Each structure stands twice: as C-alpha cells, then as structure tokens.
Design a protein around this ligand. Sequence first.
Ligand SMILES: Nc1ncnc2c1ncn2[C@@H]1O[C@H](CSCC[C@H](N)C(=O)O)[C@@H](O)[C@H]1O
Lengths: 48, 12, 362, 605
Amino acid sequence: ACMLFVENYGQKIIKKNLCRNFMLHLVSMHDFNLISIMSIDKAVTKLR
Amino acid sequence: XXXXXXXXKXXX
Amino acid sequence: YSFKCVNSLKEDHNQPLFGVQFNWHSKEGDPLVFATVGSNRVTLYECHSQGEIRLLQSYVDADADENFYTCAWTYDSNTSHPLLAVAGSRGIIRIINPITMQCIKHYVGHGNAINELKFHPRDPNLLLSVSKDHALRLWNIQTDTLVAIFGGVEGHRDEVLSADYDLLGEKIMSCGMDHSLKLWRINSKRMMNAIKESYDYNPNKTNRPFISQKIHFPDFSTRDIHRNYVDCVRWLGDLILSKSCENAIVCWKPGKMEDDIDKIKPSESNVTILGRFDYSQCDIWYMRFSMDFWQKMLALGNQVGKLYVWDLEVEDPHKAKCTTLTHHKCGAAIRQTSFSRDSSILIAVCDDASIWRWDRLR
Amino acid sequence: KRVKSEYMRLRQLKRFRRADEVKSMFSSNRQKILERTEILNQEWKQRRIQPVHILTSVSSLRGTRECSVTSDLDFPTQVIPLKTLNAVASVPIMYSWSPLQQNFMVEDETVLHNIPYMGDEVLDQDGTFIEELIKNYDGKVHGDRECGFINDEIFVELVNALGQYSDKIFEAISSMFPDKGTAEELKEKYKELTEQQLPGALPPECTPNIDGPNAKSVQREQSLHSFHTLFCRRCFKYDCFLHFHATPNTYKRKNTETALDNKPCGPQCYQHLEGAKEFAAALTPPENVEWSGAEASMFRVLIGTYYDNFCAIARLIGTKTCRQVYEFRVKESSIIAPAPAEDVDTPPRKKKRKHRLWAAHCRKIQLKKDGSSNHVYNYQPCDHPRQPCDSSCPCVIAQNFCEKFCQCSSECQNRFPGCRCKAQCNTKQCPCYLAVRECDPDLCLTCGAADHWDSKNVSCKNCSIQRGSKKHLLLAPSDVAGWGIFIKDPVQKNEFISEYCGEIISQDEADRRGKVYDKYMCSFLFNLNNDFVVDATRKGNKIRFANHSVNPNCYAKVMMVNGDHRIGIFAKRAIQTGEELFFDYRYSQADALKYVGIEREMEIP
Ligand SMILES: Nc1ncnc2c1ncn2[C@@H]1O[C@H](CSCC[C@H](N)C(=O)O)[C@@H](O)[C@H]1O
C-alpha cells in the first residue's frame, strides 16, 4: 500500500507540500510495526 | 403533553 | 383584502378534492383555464364574467384503484402545446395534453406516492419528485430521462411533502413530517454538468443506461423551526416563509441576518427566524397555501372554511394587520388553494368535492 | 426569579432596532423579486401558448360514463362524458434506500425526534403504543420548550445571576430550558467570558503541523498524540467507523535488528572523525549552524525511531549533514531522558506449545463457559498491562482467542494456532473452516490465504470477505412478495454468497425500532450477537431485497470476519441460471405465519 499510493499521489503531496507531516503518518506504521525501515527509504525517494 | 399527539391526515 | 366569493361549484364524485393548478404558463388575453385533480378524476375548467365557469374537458382514472394527490401544468416548446402532470397514491407521474387528448408518457420507479410536484422555473422539461418514498427523483420528461435522486444516505428518515425551487433556480427547499428542512444547491457544477449530458441521450448510444447522480449532503437543514410537522413552505425569493400545524407562520434565513444564502458553508447550522403572520383553527397538516404569480400577496383558507390572506409588500409582522376573508356556507375543509393569473380571481376548493370562487373587489 | 423576562426585555430592545432591519431585506428582496418576475414574464411573453379546445362526442366510445359538476349556485349544471386514462403496470413499493458494502456504528438515539404517520386504522385500538414508545424514549420528545436559546449579553447576564445583588435566577436558568446545563456551567462560562470565542481547532497551546512554518518545537509524544487518538489500528485506518479510543501504542521490541554498517558514508557523518565516532558508542562544540524548532520536532520524533542511525536522519532531512545532526542528537540527548531500547528472548523458545494444549485450554474454555454455545459477545482487545492471560483475561471472560490485535503477547496459548489446511481451508477437517473466521492471510499459507490477494483464483473457499468475491445480483418483483433478488450464474451447494452488510446497532434501539418497524411490518434486522444487532434499514447490501423459504436453495452462515461478527449466505443445493434466492429467517411460528406466511407450494399427496 505504501509505494502504490505514493506512486500516484506524491505529486499531490508535493503540491500540498505536507511532506514533513506525511512522514509523521509514516512514523506511526513503523511504530505500529506495519512497515519496517526498508520501505521508509522508498517514500522519501519518491518525494524526490 | 397531550398537544404533542398529532394524528391529522384529516381533522381531529 | 378586498374580495368576495362570487361563485361555487361541486363535482358529483364526492371523493376528497386535491391539487389545484392555474395555468400561469399561458399568454395574455388568451382564455384563462384552470385545472385540478380529485381522487381519480382530473379536472380542467375556465371561469368567466357574470360569475360563470364553463365546464371544460376533463378525464378520470378507471383502472388503477389509486387516489391522485398532486398535479401541475406542463408545456412543450416543440409542439407549442401546453400539457399538465398529475400524481397520487402510486406516484406514477402522468402528463396529458388536451390537444393530444392522451398522456402518452410513462414514468414508473417511485416507491409509494408523490407528495410534491414542480417543474423547474426555467426548464420546461424537469420535475423533481418528492414522494412518500423519502426520495427526490428529477425527470426530464422531454427526453424521457430520469435525473439524480437527492438525500439517500443522508435523506429524510421521515416523510417529506413540502419542497420548492428558488425563482432563479439554484437552490431547493424541502421539508415535511421529519420536521427537518434539508436543502440543496442546484448550481453545483456536478449537476450543472449532469443536466447538460442528461439533456442528450440515445438508448442506441451504448448498452450502459444513462447514469445520473446521487447527491446526499444538503446545504442546510434543521428541525428546531417546528416542534411538529412542517408542510407549507415556499421560497420568498431570498427569504423563506414557513409554517406548521401550530397555526403559526414565519420566515427564516440561513445563518444570521447579514449572511448571504450562497456564501454559507454546508456545515453551518446557525439559524435566523423572523415573521409572524399566523392563524388559528387549522391545527392539522396536509394543506397547500398559495402565493401570487406577482409575489405581492399571500393567501390560505382554513379547514373551517375561512381564509387567511395578506399582501407581500412593506406590510410586515411588526404588527401583522390581519385579513380574515371567509364565507359561512364553505366550512368543511379547504384542502387546496389557488388564484387566477393575477390578484383578481381565486378558487377555494373544499374537501367535499366542492369548489368556491373568490373574486377581486377592485 | 429567572432570566426569561429580562431576556424578553433585552430581546425587545434588540427587536426594536430590528424593525428597519427586518424591513430592509424584505424591501430588498422585492427588488430582487422585481427583476426576477419580469425576466420570467419576458420569456413567458416570448413563448406562445396554444388555446385549449373542449371535447366533442366520440362515436366509437359512446358506451361510457357521463358526469356533471353541480353548480353550488343557481347556474346550470353542465354535463360532460367521462373519459378514461392510459394503463401503467404497478411496481412494488420500496423505501428510498442507500447502497452499502460495509458496517457502521450509530450511537443509541436518546430522543423521540419523530412521530411517524401510520394508516390510522389500528390506532383506534392500540393507540397507546405511541406514548408507550415515548415511554421507551422516556418522555424525551422533539421540540420540547426549546425556543431558541440565550446568547451574547443575555448570556453574560446569566453570569451576573450567579452572584447576589439573584439566587433563584441562576437556579432557574439551570432548570427549565432543555439545554439548561447547570449553574456550574455558568461559572465556567464566566471564566470562558475572558475569551468568548474558541481558541482554535487545536489545544490552546501552539501545535501547528510541521509543514506549517509556525509549527512549535512540540515534543515527540504531544506531536504523535494526534495520530493515535484519531487513528485505529484495528481496521488500520483513521476513525475506523466500525470500531472512540483504542490503546496507547507503547510496546516492547528488540533494537538490535540493524546490521549496523556504520561508515563515513556521508560527508561529516558520525564518522569522518575518530573521536567523534568514539563518543558515539560511549554516549549511547557543534557548528554555528542553527536548528529550527520545526527541525527539532522530528529530532525527538526520530530519536525514538532508532536512537542510533544519525546517517538515516541525514538521509531523511537534507538541511545539514549527519554531523551537526549527530552533534545535535548528542546535544538534544544531553538534556532529555534516556530511551528503553531493550532486548528480550522470553522463557518459551520451542516445544511445550503443541496446539493440543490450546485445545486442552479449550476444554476449560468449553467445560465452563462455552457449553451453552450461544453466548457470543463482541470482540475486545484482551490487553494485559502487567498481568498474564489470566482467568480474568478480557477475551477469556469473553470466551474467545487472544487476537493478534490484542496485547496478550506471542507466548499466549489462547492465541489461535493456525490454519494448516494443505488442500484448502474450506471443508470439515479444516478447523479454521469450523472456526467462524475467514482463514487468516497470515495463517493459511497452506490454502493460498494471502497468495495473490489481488487475484481471484485459489483452492480455499473461506476467502470471500477478504477481497469481496461478490456475485451479480438481480432486481425485480419476487414470486412470493414484492421486490426480489435473483442470481445470474449457476453456483454449487456450500458456496459463498455476498455478506449481509448493514449498520450495527444496539438491541434496545432496534427493539424501539422493531416495534415501530413491526407496526409497519418492517425487519431489516439480523440478530448479530448476544450484545448487538445489524441494521439494514437505510444503508444496506444488495441482498437485502430477497425473500424467504422454508426449504430454500441457500442458507446463511454466521461469520467472524477478523474479529467482526458478520453474516454471509451459502447455497443449500444446486443453483443454475434464473433462480430465486431465499433463506430461513428463523422467527417464531406465530411470527412466521404473521410475517412470512407465504410458502409457494401445493398439496401433492
Ligand atoms: N415468504 C413470505 N411470505 C409472506 N411474507 C414474507 C415472506 N418473506 C418475507 N415476508 C415479509 O417481507 C418482509 C421483508 S421486506 C420484503 C418485502 C417483499 N418481499 C418485497 O421484496 O417487496 C418481512 O417483514 C416479512 O414479513
């Protein structure tokens, strides 16, 4: 779900420029054991 | 409380 | 304020009388003809000077053991012929043309029974149908295409009868047994668009039938206006008159006294109440008041047969100078109210298959 | 002694200034009316109308009825023949209903807020039930003595009633009005009088979102406080409208899951300086460059994430290097409290966890609490802050597993073992198939439970709700009663049919609704469990419009969809194209004759 979302809506996030807050949501899933560190890099890359 | 009873398709 | 009932008639069917309609969609100088429906008989007639109202052509249901309730005129631009639609206990809207002598249009799909009829103020071919179903079906009779329902997931839990378009045609009022007044903005681009593509279609275009919309969040609603039913509410232009079985009549505007109707958020619920042109001895629901084609006067009768009627000018409820026209013979129940296409002539229509005509003492 | 008359005296003065005001828009509206009426008059003038013509005698229709409107006056009674109208086939009635594929909770309704109409033939006899209904609602009818409310200076005048200048006045304020609150609410509003307006859509302190430039350097928990409060892990969404608060998310986890290939992989890393690298392990003059408070925010956010990988922090924030972060991470850590970062292995490692002991627990689970086999309750997270999964375990007293969403840790024998059916989870030997639950994707690797969850082909059959393998229904009148639902394509016995989705409500409201529902003879309700019931009145599935048989082709099976009590349909026999769809509603016999009496059969013997 993580990348497949941001594959489509990061530019929306980019336009919204809520990047620093979006990762905060992404903070939770690792805090929820939903996603490990490995996919964390994916999201920041897809921002850039 | 009786005024709150309304059954008035026609007249009462 | 200066009138008198000068003629009265009655139909032999003896069933209760129902929706009255005056052909405001007409031309000046032309013979003005009015129409009204009973239980299963559709009636069309024209009054004249010297107190005479010539009987006119009129039909009647003979198969559907169904009582008809509401009706309204109709007109077609292509044929240049007016028509008229009627409704009742099964809700199937039927639009007949005296010229064609027959209603040759079929529209089934409502659940129980229509309780509100009105064409769009501008479009001669649209009518949203509020019914007993707690549903709001709009129809393009000209193209025979149903249009979006209104309400649904946030529809009306209880029955709703009264609804109205704004004269310009961008917002819809709706209130009824639920005491809620849910209301939607027509000018929404979503259905501004939808109407446009609704206006054109071909069953041979594609297998997929036309897909209308489903709007579910009304712009505004509340129930604190009337602790009981609300059944007689129409657009006072930018203002919205209102009343209930409590023999009380009032207007209201959304938000505060300085708040425009269009600019308010759909999420706001603040209210502003104003108006006192009230009445008495009409403690029940299911009647239709009336307001003139020129929007200069307001009228209604009483179930005991008296009339509660006033103007719409600078006269305001700061003191609310009453005007209580009446007649002794007519007292059974005036279910329906209508005028002529002016402040001249009025029809008073009684429950016991009878009608009464009030005229201007100009 | 009350504020109403003063409120009247205050309302009248503001009413006094409103006279020209109420005149204003009324007059203004007419000008808006003025333009509107003629504009539509213009086009009304533009559009010619056709004069109507009266009927003439119809030769072939001579044998018809004639009527005459009676002139109530001395006018002649004009006579005309009747003429009939066209014929339209009737359709069964249906409430305006809204599509649904999920489940939602509505809180119980504490007010009448409705007095529905009925045909008025039974009220002549049972007319007390309506006021019995308000008794169920406890006399809380809609529109009771509201009459607007008190605000503005008159609201300020309520505060002055509290003081003595003046005693029964403020008690009266908290007595009559439905929103009276209490005199204490006046004292707090007296304190609220210092601001008279909501500070904002936030707590009064400054907690803007970080991407907002004015975001305060909010600490980790406070910044994270929003998410958990408004998130639900149970259905892994924010405001899971089917589960409100859940739990603090503090938990135990090992920290040594990192390979820890610490290298000077970034210019000015924690590395590139031996001493700087040396002090890193020990602590387990920064540059002139500064840090924003917003920048400091993630610093306390991210220190909990790893506490160690300063490089990843640099790989996150591009403002500075790993150094000047690792420096600040040292600098921030020079003030803040230490972190747990703990590792455990637990006494249980292997063996002693033969699933038969869970069945042996299950003997205890059955020998005292499950013997009735009808006491079913809503799942709850059996969370044990310090205790073990004891006899008073929340799920134990609820008589169900310690779910993975609960906080009974992995050692818990009340955890469901697994779904190990190597042909398929779909038939008698599969104990997960005997389990009320869909075969968990994490468990039935033996039946392709998670295998291609996007795809639609697998050997197991207990895999429907997890994707929504729905059929194609039909809408039409039914043979037995009104509307109906029909299937499109043939299906076999013991196969899935879409779940009976609907709103979830409580017993009493439904009991309050049902009696009203039954008065109109309505039932969009399925017995959910001993604690709740599913509503399908306004929102609803697509199967909601089917009908009943005593020997139908399909039947309903009670489901436990991932801790949610749900209810699907399964085929009793063989089905081919164009068949009706019924099931046994399982009412009382007196009810059944009252409600579903029609059976559609004749007498063969
Ligand atoms: N087999 C049956 N015979 C008579 N009534 C039935 C029935 N099955 C269901 N009903 C009635 O129908 C109600 C369900 S709502 C369904 C109504 C109708 N079948 C229609 O689709 O239009 C129940 O309250 C029940 O009383």
